Amino acid sequence: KTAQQLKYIKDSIKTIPDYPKAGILFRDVTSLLENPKAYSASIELLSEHYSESGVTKVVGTEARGFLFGAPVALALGVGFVPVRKPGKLPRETISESYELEYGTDTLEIHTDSIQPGDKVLVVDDLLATGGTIEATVKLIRRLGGEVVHAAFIINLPELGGEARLTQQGIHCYSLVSFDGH
């Protein structure tokens, strides 16, 4: 059943060749979002895996992360805290930076939404280089949150996200894995 749900999940994700630019494969989770079965099972499986873990908040990073972290928060019956692109959160924020191809950008979190003692699970769609999750984890930790787990629908191991998270004291968990080739 679990093994079968995973294959059903993996086949609902479409692979787009030469996106964004040529010789690059893109895994489109939106084909999963429109398959009611695959989408519920993905949230069931992420929830169940963290039932025994004592999580008090889930953090998801804008925007595809919203689609997995928020339903996981709902299933665990805990609060959801969003990490956002700059200038969207209205209350007091802190900021972290992360690298893009051509520059740098920032993520923000509300300072009142995390505090000492919170046990935080990060949920996201995609572990690629891991730069956004690294920035997200530093946000959570600067506010005294404890983060040991990050959960992903898709893992791209050839980009070495996993070991970069391990270096930062995060154990990663993922549903499916895809090759870069």
Tell whether omega for the bond before 20 is within 30 degrees of 0, i.e. cis. Answer: yes
Whether the Cβ atoms of residue 92 and residue 109 lie closer than 8 Å to each other: no
* Tokens encoding 7: 């294959």
Tell me: does residue 115 bind Na ion (CB under 5 A).
yes
Which residues between 67 and 96 bind its own copies (CB under 8 A)?
Answer: 67, 70-71, 73-74, 77-82, 84, 88-91
If the CB atoms of residues 48 and 166 are measured against its own copies, the closer one turns out to be 48
47 binds, among its own copies, Na ion, none (CB under 5 to 8 A by kind): none
C-alpha to C-alpha distance for 10 and 32, rounded to whole angstroms: 9
The one among 55, 121, 143, 176 contacting Na ion by CB under 5 A: 143
Which residues between 8 and 67 bind its own copies (CB under 8 A)?
Answer: 14, 16, 19-20, 26, 28, 30, 33-36, 39-40, 43, 57, 62-63, 66-67
Catalytic residue numbers, as ranges: 64, 101
Binding stretches for its own copies (CB under 8 A): 14, 16, 19-20, 26, 28, 30, 33-36, 39-40, 43, 57, 62-63, 66-67, 70-71, 73-74, 77-82, 84, 88-91, 110, 113
